[PDB]
Design a binder for these strands. Structure first.
Ligand SMILES: Nc1ncnc2c1ncn2[C@@H]1O[C@H](COP(=O)(O)OP(=O)(O)O)[C@@H](O)[C@H]1O
Ligand code: BEF
Ligand SMILES: [Mn+2]
Length: 437
DNA sequence: TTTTTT
């Protein structure tokens, strides 16, 4: 099944169910043939996990690259997160024969930028093959999994869960993964469970992967941070079936609005989340709501997210980001989106001389669109004006509060606006212009 | 994801 290594560069797809071996068996096979393989995965947890597993199951200690830990062994297989790959500077000259863009169903901006980088540098780097692997391609619909029995939750149970309940005997003893749409819910549920005498831990972006025990009874409560790649050896997965997403609204008031909303999971999410169990053995998947929305396309806001990440984390200029996103959108078989590259590139191109201290603060705070948030703050500081509001999002300006006055020079909307507003700032006029033509 | 001196 795995694509054969051609004589000249070629991009191929690899589609197989969750747990089939795409991220482990396949690269092992390629390595056995004498090829140097690089596997890019969006999950730090899974990446670190591949190192241990491959070591004691495939008799191979691969190189590991993540922002948390690096392991260089010199093996013919390297596992790296897209993030670390971008941070390292992309493809290295003549380093690998095959590059596997693993879990290519992921629509987070880091994965998009990472895959686009590969599609644009691979051939020049000397790679002869690029593989786009996923158990859930664009137009895919959730299909029955041989190892996973799906059981709906009911109103019976001593643990409230998104309108339904979870019976304690369903998670008492054994290993279980519970998906919650938000970090706050994860903390609350874990606490609720711990209080009942169960071994429960929360996990989401920001916490150490070590919080999840390798063995022994445990109930992990997580966000989509454990949706893909990861094998936690769970006997079951309980899914709230909801997720948090973002949408861009060109509301011209004065420019655009990026609204975050909680909605039902799409087909990719349902299959990937379900697939965290039933990996190399039988498992159970319990759900709150059946069905799901179609997959295959993402919002223009994700493109905005890519430019933002490029500027804030990967030292990529807007033009550089465009080159990479074009490669991604010009390759068939991947998630599609409106072609708003010109628009978004022009938007970020005008955002110069951001206050580094603010950028640093929004990145560490883990805010969405840290560059846009920090840039709005930068403009407020320079105009000696207050932020749109005084919610956590704008705390980086508290130190200047006593000096801030007048209306806020609104560049765009990222949340609720309480203070008066002015739309005459050069940047606001520029963005409005970008939206015109 | 990516990410801390003297
Ligand atoms: N970290 C791990 N710990 C234990 N088993 C693992 C681990 N990773 C993979 N496996 C085993 O190998 C199989 C294939 O895993 P993997 O390659 O990640 O699947 P996928 O096809 O979803 O990419 C799993 O079903 C499981 O039995
Ligand atoms: F499809 Be597997 F869960 F990476
Ligand atoms: Mn995988």
């Amino acid at each position: 099944s795995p694509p054969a290594v051609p004589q000249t560069f070629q991009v191929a797809h690899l589609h197989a169910p969750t747990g089939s071996g795409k991220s482990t068996k396949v690269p092992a096979a390629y390595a056995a043939q004498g090829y140097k393989v690089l596997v890019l995965n969006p999950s730090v947890a899974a990446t670190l996990g591949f190192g241990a597993y491959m070591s004691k199951a495939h008799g191979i200690d691969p190189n590991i690259r993540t922002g948390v830990r690096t392991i260089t062994t010199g093996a013919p297989i390297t596992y790296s997160t897209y993030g670390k790959f971008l941070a390292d500077g992309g493809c290295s000259g003549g380093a690998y024969d095959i590059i596997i863009c693993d879990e290519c169903h992921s629509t987070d901006s880091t994965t998009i930028l990472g895959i686009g980088t590969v599609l644009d540098q691979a051939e020049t780097a000397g790679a002869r093959l690029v593989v786009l692997a996923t158990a859930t391609p664009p137009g895919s619909v959730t299909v029955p999994h041989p190892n996973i029995e799906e059981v709906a939750l009911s109103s019976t149970g001593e643990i409230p869960f998104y309108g339904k309940a979870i019976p304690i005997e369903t998670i008492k003893g054994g290993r279980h993964l519970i998906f919650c749409h938000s970090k706050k819910k994860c903390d609350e549920l874990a606490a609720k469970l711990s209080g009942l005498g169960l071994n429960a831990v929360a996990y989401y972006r920001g916490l150490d992967v070590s919080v999840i025990p390798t063995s022994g009874d445990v109930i992990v409560v997580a966000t989509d941070a454990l949706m893909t790649g990861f094998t936690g050896d769970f006997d079951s997965v309980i899914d709230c079936n909801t997720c948090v997403t973002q949408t861009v609204d060109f509301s011209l008031d004065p420019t655009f609005t990026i609204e975050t909303t909680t909605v039902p999971q799409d087909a990719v999410s349902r299959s990937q989340r379900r697939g965290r169990t039933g990996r190399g053995r039988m498992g159970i998947y319990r759900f709150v709501t059946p069905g799901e929305r179609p997959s295959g396309m993402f919002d223009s806001s994700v493109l905005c997210e890519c430019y933002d990440a490029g500027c804030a984390w990967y030292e990529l200029t807007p033009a550089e980001t465009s080159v990479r996103l074009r490669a991604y959108l010009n390759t068939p078989g991947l998630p599609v989106c409106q072609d708003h590259l010109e628009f978004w590139e022009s938007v970020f191109t005008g955002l110069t001389h951001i206050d580094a201290h603010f950028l640093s603060q929004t990145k560490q705070a883990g805010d969405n669109f840290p560059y846009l948030v920090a840039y709005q703050a930068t403009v407020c500081a320079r105009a000696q004006a207050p932020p749109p509001s005084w919610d956590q999002m704008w705390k980086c300006l508290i130190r200047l509060k006593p000096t801030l006055h007048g209306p806020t020079p609104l560049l765009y909307r990222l949340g609720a606006v309480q203070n008066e507003v002015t739309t005459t700032h050069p940047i606001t006029k520029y963005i409005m212009a970008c939206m015109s033509a």
